[PDB]
Amino acid sequence: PYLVPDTQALCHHLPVIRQLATSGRFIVIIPRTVIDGLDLLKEHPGARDGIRYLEAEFKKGNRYIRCQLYKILDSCKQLTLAQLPLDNPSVLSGALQAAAHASVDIKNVLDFYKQW
Known part of the structure; x- marks a missing residue:
């Protein structure tokens, strides 16, 4: 099963992603638009640690993690490449076309984490 982090998810909830990516129950696909978004943002220190973490997991030999409105739907385009995938952003409950x-x-x- 695939989880795919938003930039916001990585920037603000890195320890959730750490847990899931280390769980070994998921493969974490980090989309190119997210990875490149974070290079831009690394400014925001969330961005800088989002990347640094990701490289640390790479370094430690984690095989369960990879890199590959607008953002929301851009993951969609990267997700239909993998198409049970599952997307992780922020702004939970409250663009209706995106989810559609x-x-x-x-x-x-x-929400995903507390369910998990």
Whole structure:
């Protein structure tokens, strides 16, 4: 099963992603648009640690993690490449067309995490 972090998810909830990516129960696909978004943002210190963490997991030999409105739907395009995938952003409950794209779950990081 695939989880795909938002930039916001990585920037603000890195310890949730750490848990999930280390769980070994998921493969974490980090989309190119997110990875490149974080290079831009690393400013925001969330961005700088989002990347640094990701490289630390790479370094430690984690095989369960990879890199590969607008953002929301851009993950969609990267997700239909993998199409049980599942998207992790922030802004949970409260763009209606984005989620309406039928093949993939979008759940808030902490919503997914607390469910998990």
